[PDB]
Amino acid sequence: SMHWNDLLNSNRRKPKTSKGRQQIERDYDRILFAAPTRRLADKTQVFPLDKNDSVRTRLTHSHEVANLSRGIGMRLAFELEDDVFKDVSEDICLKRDVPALLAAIGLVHDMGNPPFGAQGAKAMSEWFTKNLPEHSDNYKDKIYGDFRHFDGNSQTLRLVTKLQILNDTYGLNLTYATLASMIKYPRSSESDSSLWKKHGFFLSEKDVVQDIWNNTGLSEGVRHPFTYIMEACDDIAYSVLDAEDIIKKGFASFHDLIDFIQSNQFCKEDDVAKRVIENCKKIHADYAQQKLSPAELNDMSMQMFRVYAIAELVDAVVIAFKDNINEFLNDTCEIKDLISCSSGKNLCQALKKFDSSRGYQHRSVLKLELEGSNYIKGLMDMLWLGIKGRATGDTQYDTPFGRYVYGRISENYRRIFEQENNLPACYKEAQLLADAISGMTDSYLIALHDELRALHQYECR
Amino acid sequence: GSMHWNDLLNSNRRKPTSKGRQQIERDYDRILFAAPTRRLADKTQVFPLDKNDSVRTRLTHSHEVANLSRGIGMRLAFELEDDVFKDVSEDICLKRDVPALLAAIGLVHDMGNPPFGAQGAKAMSEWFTKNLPEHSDNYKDKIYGDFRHFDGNSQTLRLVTKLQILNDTYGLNLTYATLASMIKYPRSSESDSSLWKKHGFFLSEKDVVQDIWNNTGLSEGVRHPFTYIMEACDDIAYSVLDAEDIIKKGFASFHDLIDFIQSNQFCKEDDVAKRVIENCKKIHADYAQQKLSPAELNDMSMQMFRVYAIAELVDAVVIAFKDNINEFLNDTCEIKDLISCSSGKNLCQALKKFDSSRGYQHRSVLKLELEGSNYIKGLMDMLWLGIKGRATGDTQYDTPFGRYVYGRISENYRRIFEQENNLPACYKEAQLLADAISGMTDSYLIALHDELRALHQYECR
Amino acid sequence: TYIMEACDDIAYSVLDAEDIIKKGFASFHDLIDFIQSNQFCKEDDVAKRVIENCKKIHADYAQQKLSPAELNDMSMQMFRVYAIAELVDAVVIAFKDNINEFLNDTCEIKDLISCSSGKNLCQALKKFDSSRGYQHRSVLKLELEGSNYIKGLMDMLWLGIKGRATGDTQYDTPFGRYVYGRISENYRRIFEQENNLPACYKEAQLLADAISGMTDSYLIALHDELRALHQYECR
Ligand SMILES: Nc1nc2c(ncn2[C@H]2C[C@H](O)[C@@H](COP(=O)(O)OP(=O)(O)OP(=O)(O)O)O2)c(=O)[nH]1
Ligand SMILES: Nc1nc2c(ncn2[C@H]2C[C@H](O)[C@@H](COP(=O)(O)OP(=O)(O)OP(=O)(O)O)O2)c(=O)[nH]1
Ligand SMILES: Cc1cn([C@H]2C[C@H](O)[C@@H](COP(=O)(O)OP(=O)(O)OP(=O)(O)O)O2)c(=O)[nH]c1=O
Ligand SMILES: Cc1cn([C@H]2C[C@H](O)[C@@H](COP(=O)(O)OP(=O)(O)OP(=O)(O)O)O2)c(=O)[nH]c1=O
Ligand SMILES: Cc1cn([C@H]2C[C@H](O)[C@@H](COP(=O)(O)OP(=O)(O)OP(=O)(O)O)O2)c(=O)[nH]c1=O
Ligand SMILES: [Mg+2]
Ligand SMILES: [Mg+2]
Ligand SMILES: [Mg+2]
């Protein structure tokens, strides 16, 4: 029974330019002009430290997700407006707010992801599992599960709300609609839930999220309706474009993907998959007549595969959203994802399985991921020498290497760490380390690791 | 004989899905999903091969320009519609077409820029000056001036029209409005126009551009009105953002920029410059109270200077466009640029001068540009061994190194090179070399140069 | 010799495709699609039988929990068996049918494969190897490197070989004498034999015999060592 008036709340958290621009539009400008958005250009999606420049990075993936979300917003505002946007106040300009909101929401997702992709985050978690023992009295509290089960969504929210500090504790000061629709999992690490398997915000954001809920009609475990659209766009985008990158790299062929989709027990009779396969086969028959090398033929065929699969999946997602709009607006929505409720469920699942089999588990990818895990763990080990004990009071950081390595951390991150709040000291220093590591690009991480290892030779005997 | 918005917003395509998406909107998707768009992430804007991940690259520059153009289009369509768009048929929806058209035009504006920035292009030109001598009868014709004065816009047009070939001769098959608006300088190298100092297309596109004009009501010399918007957005988004990058790199300080603007002869009494300086000083006074390092203070002061300057310049550009819309719609418009006819001319010119003084002409920048020039010239010398004589008939390319080098060139560019047309053979060879080199990223160019130099050790004797 | 040529063609056409699949340059389904989409193998009975048997075995193989690389490897392991058996049987049948023509004093048969029922499958496999195995980035780069190595080594050896038989004493430089001493003694012994061959022909034959007999690693090592030893005379 949620109302679109509060779901599209244009107010901002900071207590009270902008010439001919809605506040939601200004949120997109704030997100785009932020340093983490630019740093996304050197964060891995699937293949780390890739030499090929046509393979998706985190920034290109984010922009493509934003474009897909903006297209869905265009299809929802200029069309089907009377079907999903019922009982909306006249002051709200849907045609300008909804597409901008979806585009900004898609762009801002994966902003806080750690370097080296998902396997990077695991590495961080593993470090936080060893250096923050659960049996230890200091870290026995379950709030430290924010670090032992580290994920990029909570870091994205922290970055957009606290880390991007200029002179206030409100970060980028995004609108309530963007902050509400940015939370992919409305639950904390301490809270237990079966609907969501991942925490969506840190303990430090627990009040902030509450504020957002109080200003949007949401609550714990209830997602903003546009969060489902953003998640569906994210899934579609990475599932298709990772397959494109795999085939372009040469790890697989276009016929390999076609045979995988055809032989999948779920896509064998799926109408969307059948239509996509038929169109791709029809275009590939025409393409094969040209005098092309096999690699060029594969890339040409999979560009049309991109077009057809993206169009079909986006249409299915829009239809599913329009059909289940009442369910999404319910105060007790239980939908896991928009893709599962659409007809493109089987095709997306098959694409994800193909990306896992021929992608993530490739030999070069695995070796690069092990190297990145070693780099990340070494960097966190060296940073902990300068971070640990700074907030509790123990002066183990007073060594020259500790002081220098504390000086190498982000200044705004240290300002947030040096703030006076109710967070426990160990949580504060662990959060500082998590922010520092997750804010780094791959190349910056390698360079800093090498430099600090060179500078650590004396204190490491 | 003023042009009409019906012809200027022509959504037809050159070639003789689409579920709820306008054609101009689909042009943005075609541009964004194109490989060169994401290859722009590794092409220099000002600082070549910069280790700082926050310094703007060509992709971030293009995205910022696209966002600014989309904002201006939103202002033009949603707000200033009755005074800017007149006698517009109901078939074209301005609210969806104009913002999308401007966003696509801004995103595509620097797709074909050569590696290592403008200086890199200069390097290419220098090589084409030596290896295609004017006194030689083979290259005596003025058409080869397309290569002696190589520019990124000419390469971008042929990239979006011919180089992105799958099975057509129409490239990405963009709409006529998108193709017309992307032509920054509507003149060829052979043509002698005093209005435009640079050619905007090669001889190979001489027919194609003509077609665009025939379908848009334009002509040689006259420029699409939205191209002025794109040029103004590009100028603003590089003038401000390059200054921000200069401050971030440590080459200058916030007070340095403030003093440069205040001491500027034209910005001394400029109202826009005075307003920007006053607002920045007011914010910086509050910012200086907090315990901050000088670098962080400069960074977060420039973070507000960027917001204020971008807002003021965008508003001034929109006002200038609205005031002079009749002149821009004239068949014989003579306006050089939108910035110069606006109230933000002085501030933008001063920012460009500041970037020239502090950003370029810097020791590290100059050294890196010389290294990039050497790299580009060596790579082009190596590729000319495998390219020269391929079309004329001279079998000097038949050495094993020449065959391998030809095989290392992009298959799309080779496919376009081997097409049957009326272009001169020497022109085709030089165009193949220019297309191969201009599309490379910096890292790819360095890697290919090193690998081919290692492989050339025998034939170089 | 026709039997040998047919066996050579079969044993490289099938085994090079297997090597292509093993290296990861292509997949088993890629080869199956290439054979099925081939113009001549579209209706070839031997190709149809091989494809059907391979598909039947691969359907059973795909049930087990396997990585894609292992599935491709063990599917091509059965494709090799089926294709080799069919091609060998076809070659034997063709030889038996045309034995009288092969025993003719003026036989004109180009090859045993082309006159057999396995011509289309072998030709398609050769085309697949050309498309995917050769003309590959790594293969082309390695071949260019090998060409440079071979040409440099032959240039270095020509300094010690040229003029040895004609009479021109341009080989008498210390590098030339050492290079000649580094050539195989069997090939030098054949080169120094007295016969009616032209002196230039003998010198070129000595160089060709010396170079063609080298392995790849030996060629690289000798090229590097002689290039290091040639730094003075190369000035
Ligand atoms: N190299 C490598 N890449 C992976 C792996 N797993 C996933 N990826 C890729 C696929 C995606 O583009 C991205 C993972 O997607 P996300 O982490 O953003 O999913 P998230 O849990 O945030 O929410 P979602 O599943 O989209 O609902 O990295 C892996 O195990 N190894
Ligand atoms: N390192 C370096 N960067 C330069 C130089 N000249 C310009 N840049 C920067 C400024 C711009 O962001 C960009 C050049 O853009 P352009 O002005 O050349 O674009 P275009 O001529 O096509 O149109 P426009 O002049 O902007 O109206 O690189 C230079 O000489 N050295
Ligand atoms: C300067 C820089 C920082 N980083 C990482 C390191 C930190 O984890 C994170 C923040 O460090 P910062 O040095 O504070 O980055 P910034 O000041 O340029 O921009 P902002 O503070 O608004 O984010 O950015 C990189 O990955 N590459 C770089 O070049
Ligand atoms: C693959 C690749 C190409 N390039 C350059 C080199 C060429 O000049 C240009 C085209 O070479 P291609 O390799 O043909 O690029 P692509 O086919 O993958 O994508 P598209 O043709 O749609 O652009 O791209 C890079 O800079 N880095 C790379 O990784
Ligand atoms: C010894 C040796 C020779 N070769 C090449 C170099 C010569 O071209 C060719 C003959 O050189 P030889 O050294 O004379 O070979 P061999 O005498 O041991 O055996 P045989 O004469 O019966 O063949 O063999 C290698 O490739 N690797 C080696 O280790
Ligand atoms: Mg994502
Ligand atoms: Mg530009
Ligand atoms: Mg053989």
Residue numbers in the entry:
A (entry chain A): 0 to 15, 25 to 469
B (entry chain B): -1 to 14, 25 to 469
C (entry chain K): 235 to 469
Copy text verbatim from the article accompanying this structure deposition:
pmcDeoxynucleoside triphosphohydrolase (dNTPase) enzymes are effector proteins in animal and bacterial cells that hydrolyze dNTP nucleotides and inhibit viral replication. We therefore named the dNTPase-NTase anti-phage defense system Clover and designated the dNTPase protein as Clover protein A (CloA) and the accessory NTase protein as Clover protein B (CloB). Together these results demonstrate that CloA is a dGTPase effector that senses phage infection by specifically responding to elevated dTTP concentrations associated with viral replication. Clover defense encodes an accessory enzyme CloB that synthesizes an additional nucleotide signal p3diT that suppresses CloA activation and protects uninfected cells from aberrant nucleotide depletion. p3diT binds to CloA in an allosteric site adjacent to the dTTP binding pocket and raises the threshold of intracellular dNTP levels required to trigger full Clover immune activation.
To define the mechanism of nucleotide signaling in Clover anti-phage defense, we mutated the Salmonella CloA active site (H126A/E129A) to allow direct comparison of dGTP substrate interactions and determined cryo-EM structures of CloA in the suppressed CloA–dGTP–p3diT (2.6 Å) or activated CloA–dGTP–dTTP (2.6 Å) states. In the CloA–dGTP–dTTP active state structure, dTTP is bound at the CloAAB interface in an adjacent pocket to the p3diT binding site formed by loops α3A–α4A and α3B–α4B from each CloA protomer and the C-terminal helical bundle α18B–α21B. A distinct set of conserved CloA residues form 13 hydrogen-bond interactions with dTTP that coordinate the nucleotide triphosphate moiety at each of the α-(R47A and S418A), β- (K256B), and γ-phosphate (R47A, Q172A, and N420A) positions. The dTTP ribose sugar backbone is coordinated by the side-chain of CloA residue R47A and the peptide main-chain of residue A444A. In contrast, in the dTTP-bound active state, dGTP is coordinated by an additional set of five contacts that reorient substrate interactions and complete active site formation.
